[PDB]
Amino acid sequence: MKIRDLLKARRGPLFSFEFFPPKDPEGEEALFRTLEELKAFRPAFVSITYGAMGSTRERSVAWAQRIQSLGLNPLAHLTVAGQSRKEVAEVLHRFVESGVENLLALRGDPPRGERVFRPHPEGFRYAAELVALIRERYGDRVSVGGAAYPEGHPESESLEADLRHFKAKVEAGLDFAITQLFFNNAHYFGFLERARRAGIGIPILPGIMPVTSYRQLRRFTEVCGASIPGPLLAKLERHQDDPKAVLEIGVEHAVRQVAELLEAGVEGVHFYTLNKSPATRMVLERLGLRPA
Template sequence: MTSVVQRLETGQPTFSVEFFPPRDAEDEQILWRAIRNLEVLDPAYVSVTYGAGGHNRDRTIRTTGRIASETTLVPMAHLTAVDHSVTELRNVLGWYAAVGVQNVLAIRGDPPGDVDGEWIPHPEGLRYAEELVELVRELGDFCVGVAASPYGHPRSTDLESDTKYLIRKLNAGADFAIAQLFFAPEDFLRLRDRIAAAGCEKRMIPGILPLTTKKTLTKTAELSGAPIPDWLARTLDPYADDPKGFRAAGMDVITENCRRLLDEGVDNLHFYTFNRSKATSELVERLGLVPARTG
């Protein structure tokens, strides 16, 4: 089995993609069309999300298992601690190992139903993401990633404390962190600088959203809490009623953002696909990203 870290240590820039588990048979066809279209580009790895409260757990396991057994791709499965006992988490990790999934993104997760609600741990579960990282490490030879926020987690009181908790997750045994959505490359680079200034050398990976529709921009900003910079609003506002113009302008912005990140030494760009392949394929082509070939 191949780890995410192995796939990233190529000495050249790579890209990766994120999918979510299908809700029904039609969604599954759409997902697998995207998987096959992107497979030929040889992304370094592909991640599959895990629903709040574990309600998509079986679909996540099934999807990552199929990717491991039916494709040439390296899968990374998400795992959250929400509403799970330690025994259940152990079982999930056992299932991942059994289907050939060696890479796990360990996330505490949001409260089911209300992401802003009170986070209440399972009475026989875990309270913090760092505990989940430790559990994953205890149960097998997994490569482990964690989540990071350029703006600080909504429950953090300030960036200083947020940085401290992120470093605790990394030091608990994580190999890397994937930064959640941002629109300005400087915001990710400041996060990377904060981690480096604290003496942590773990890899920081930016999560990239292809900007193709106004709805996508508005909804993801609302869900993630990522601020829309004034310069981005000024760039895209003229195309509010012009879908083709919005897509063209949005993709130009993201292309330039990615180029800035690559120029700053970022070696992996993680694209949120929404189970589609066209925008990601276009960005990869524009950026001239060389697919990872090792592992």
């Protein structure tokens, strides 16, 4: 099913899950056992994140076909970093010929432990270039999403420039966007209001990742650019070495965030889920969405 059509039905909120590349073959089988269990939940779409800069490229195509084999709807993450325009086009074709109908067009992170993006010398620079590629080569045969940053990309120089680049990416041909994770709902609603004033009408799905360890915060603030609201931050940093209390804190905070988002009639919620972590399952149970 195309995500644009799932969204168009307005059948209540779409719940989606994003997983991380498995470390070894037993972890891979464990992850697919988890996706098999997940089908009962009837997720809207599932994905596993892309790019060890390129990847794992044949691996990520294979994982999308395996997800489809389970009767789940894969969203293929497709990046431009570390790859020529022609390599990007090749991988794109491999996903679509494999029956992937949903693509998330992204710039992609730089390589591990490197902070500054530098384009491939014969590659794209901006995700909006990949969106335009897909639309010109496939049109409506696929449904295309992009990332959105309610608190702004760390590398942008103001929220208003950031919004203007987001509008350009939507106009290149997005059907929906999924946000970077955030912990303060008011910054998501405020992004939605900037987007509304800018006449952007596409569905924008909030992305949520419950805090599961204190060591995540540095990735969250510095790399993802998400602020941690004061009351939450206080609790976390008084409990860093009680991983039991950090987890329960993160779960509680995510439950309350998602409850408000669902009461605000968001088009769906996209959950960033560590492969082994029970954080997301606990959130869903506490919300009444999954059996205890």
